Amino acid sequence: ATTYNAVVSKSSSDGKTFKTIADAIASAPAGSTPFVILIKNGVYNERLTITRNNLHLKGESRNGAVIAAATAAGTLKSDGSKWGTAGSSTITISAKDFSAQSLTIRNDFDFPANQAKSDSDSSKIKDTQAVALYVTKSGDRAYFKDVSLVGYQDTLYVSGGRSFFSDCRISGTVDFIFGDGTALFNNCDLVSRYRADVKSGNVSGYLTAPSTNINQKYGLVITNSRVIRESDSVPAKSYGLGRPWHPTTTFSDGRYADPNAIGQTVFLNTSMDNHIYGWDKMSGKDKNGNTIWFNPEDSRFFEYKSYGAGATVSKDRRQLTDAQAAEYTQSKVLGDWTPTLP
Ligand SMILES: COC(=O)[C@H]1O[C@H](O[C@@H]2[C@H](O)[C@@H](O)[C@@H](O[C@@H]3[C@H](O)[C@@H](O)[C@@H](O[C@@H]4[C@H](O)[C@@H](O)[C@@H](O[C@@H]5[C@H](O)[C@@H](O)[C@@H](O[C@@H]6[C@H](O)[C@@H](O)[C@@H](O)O[C@@H]6C(=O)O)O[C@@H]5C(=O)O)O[C@@H]4C(=O)O)O[C@@H]3C(=O)O)O[C@@H]2C(=O)OC)[C@H](O)[C@@H](O)[C@H]1O
């Protein structure tokens, strides 16, 4: 039993359809009854902010139904101010019980073309984060099935509550899954991208940059997945599994890297190609304005039964026991929430 409240299409000959996804979402009655939108194949150049609870998008196909926009953190607004990382997102989820199925979400900011620009080019952006999907503190219970997320730096920003990614593709370079949310990934392809701008022997990127609060039980949990290189040109030992993001945060005594954002990333039963070297450190600014380094050994970085060429076991790559691994089931990670589609 599946029925649609609204249909989005590129064709006028399709029938009683909306031309834009934003229009279809806006047409939903105020409230929290389920609202399900079918999105027919096409590229929809739109930026969306979801504020209605119990909204559900279903694409005709992951390959063919695309929601895309090009926005970097350093892209300037009309008033001349920057969008910023949060502000750069193609899709922002600020409601509960959202789901998306069988669609692609892209940030089309051309990171490689930006980096290839001459240093004196005033159009060359320094703030190169460009978010495809952002789940905010107001999104809890967000479910993404058979979804592809496309970007380079900061592709997926998961904050606040619980999100679940299933049968997914996520691509990027630097910190491409990051934030303080409880985010579970099952049967996903995590695709590390080629960096034309990085010298041989330097780091090309980091899969994760968790900012999980120390009192929060679960951060980024990746299960039954595949950690893969985009191409053979992605060098061996060029990508970190994670580095600890301690976000600049406003406190009573100033604005500086959050000491209690001691991130968790756990990989269970996940394949890894040899582009992976292990975990890494990350820097921020402390309460005095000095550089401060946060180390992987002080963070909640673990693996369980990784395989493939990138899966070395060493003192620098901590392993869960069987008993500890049992704590990372879908049931335990997501608690009372069972992700379901309409
Ligand atoms: C004025 O107050 C209000 O009205 C509201 O405030 C709230 O919103 C806050 C905040 O004000 C707002 O700006 C925003 O902030 C987020 C984030 O929370 C901040 O910590 C900050 O993050 C930046 C950056 O945007 C992130 O992408 C990330 O970047 C890291 C590195 O720090 C950065 O240097 C860079 O890495 C380089 C290099 O680019 C890379 O290639 C590689 O070589 O590594 C380098 C390195 O330095 O290591 O990129 C990294 C990355 O991509 O991950 O962290 C930064 C940081 O920690 O400073 O800014 C963000 C933003 O601007 O969007 O949202 C906040 C919020 O939502 O609060 C929870 C309140 O929420 C609201 O209630 C009002 O009060």
* Domains of the chain from N-terminus onward: 1-342 (2.160.20.10)
| CA angle (130, 135, 137) in 5-degree steps | 125
Six-digit token pair at 323?
A: 């008993």
Six-digit token pair at 86?
A: 């949060």
291-294/282-285 β-pairing: antiparallel
Q: How far apart are CA 56 and CA 77, in angstroms?
A: 30
Q: How far apart are CA 174 and CA 208, in angstroms?
A: 8
Assess whether the C-beta atom of 180 lies below 6 angstroms from ligand 1: no
The experimental resolution of this structure, in angstroms, equals 1.8
Residue 202 in marked binding region: yes
Q: Which of 335, 337, 318, 328 is nearest to 185 (CA)?
A: 328
The amino acid at residue 240 is G
Are 151 and 106 within 8 A, CB to CB? Answer: yes
Contact partners, residue 49, CB within 8 Å, separation at least 6: 91, 92, 94
Q: Which of 313, 280, 273, 274 is nearest to 294 (CA)?
A: 280
For residue 199, how far is its CA from the centre of ligand 1 (angstroms)?
26
Q: Which of 14, 15, 12, 20 is nearest to 37 (CA)?
A: 20
Q: Which residue reads 């922002």 in tokens?
A: 92
Q: How far apart are CA 106 and CA 5, in angstroms?
A: 25
Name the residue at shortest CA distance from atom 53 of ligand 1.
175
| Alpha carbon 16 to its chain's center | 34
Residue 312 in marked binding region: no
Contact partners, residue 97, CB within 8 Å, separation at least 6: 53, 54, 55, 141, 142
Tell me which residues are annotated as active site: 154, 175
Assess whether the C-beta atom of 178 lies below 6 angstroms from ligand 1: yes
Contact partners, residue 314, CB within 8 Å, separation at least 6: 278
Contact partners, residue 166, CB within 8 Å, separation at least 6: 143, 144, 145, 146, 185, 186, 187, 188, 339
Name the residue at shortest CA distance from atom 61 of ligand 1.
85
Q: Which of 93, 109, 105, 22 is nearest to 59 (CA)?
A: 105
Q: How far apart are CA 124 and CA 72, in angstroms?
A: 11
Name the residue at shortest CA distance from atom 9 of ligand 1.
249
Question: What 3 state SS string does the chain have?
Answer: CCCCCEEECCCCCCCCCECCHHHHHHCCCCCCCCEEEEECCEEEECCEEECCCCEEEEECCCCCEEEEECCCCCCECCCCCECHHHHCCCEEECCCCCEEEEEEEEECCCHHHHHHCCCCCCCCCCCCCCCCEEECCCCCCEEEEEEEEECCCCCEEECCCEEEEECCEEEECEEEEEECCEEEEECCEEEECCCCCCCCCCCCEEEEEECCECCCCCCEEEECCEEEECCCCCCCCCEEEECCCCCEEEECCEEEECCCECCEEEEECCEECCCEEECCCEEEECCCCCEEEECHHHCEEEEECCECCCCCCECCECECCHHHHHHHCHHHHHCCCCCCCC
Q: How far apart are CA 200 and CA 258, in angstroms?
A: 33
Burial zone of 218 (CB within 10 Å; 0-12 exposed, 13-18 middle, 19+ buried): buried
Residue 291 in marked binding region: no
Assess whether the C-beta atom of 308 lies below 6 angstroms from ligand 1: no
CA atoms within 13 A on the CB side of 232: 0
For residue 36, how far is its CA from the centre of ligand 1 (angstroms)?
33
Q: How far apart are CA 298 and CA 287, in angstroms?
A: 19
Name the residue at shortest CA distance from atom 1 of ligand 1.
250
Six-digit token pair at 326?
A: 């049992």
Residue environment code for 133-171, b if the CB has 16+ CB neighbours within 10 A, otherwise e: bbbbebbbbbbbbbbbbbbbbbbbbbbbbbbbbbebbbb
For residue 133, how far is its CA from the centre of ligand 1 (angstroms)?
15
Q: Which of 174, 173, 136, 172 is nearest to 157 (CA)?
A: 136
Q: How far apart are CA 265 and CA 156, in angstroms?
A: 14
Instruction: Please give the C-alpha separations between residue 233 and each of 109, 137, 192, in angstroms, as whole numbers.
Output: 21, 37, 11
CA atoms within 13 A on the CB side of 283: 5
Six-digit token pair at 225?
A: 């997945």
Q: How far apart are CA 22 and CA 26, in angstroms?
A: 6
- Nearest atom in ligand 1 to the alpha carbon of residue 153 is 52
Q: How far apart are CA 266 and CA 320, in angstroms?
A: 9
Residue 216 in marked binding region: no
Q: How far apart are CA 55 and CA 79, in angstroms?
A: 32
Six-digit token pair at 278?
A: 């292990």
Residue 52 in marked binding region: no
Q: How far apart are CA 275 and CA 267, in angstroms?
A: 16
Are 185 and 142 within 8 A, CB to CB? Answer: no
248-251/220-223 β-pairing: unpaired
| Alpha carbon 81 to its chain's center | 24
The experimental method, as deposited, was X-ray
- Nearest atom in ligand 1 to the alpha carbon of residue 243 is 48
Q: Which of 209, 146, 214 is nearest to 183 (CA)?
A: 209
Question: Per this entry, what is the length of the chain?
Answer: 342
Q: How far apart are CA 136 and CA 141, in angstroms?
A: 11
Burial zone of 331 (CB within 10 Å; 0-12 exposed, 13-18 middle, 19+ buried): exposed
Q: How far apart are CA 59 and CA 66, in angstroms?
A: 8
Q: Which of 85, 260, 281 to mutate to test the pocket of ligand 1 (most atoms within 8 A of CB)?
A: 85
Q: How far apart are CA 42 and CA 103, in angstroms?
A: 10
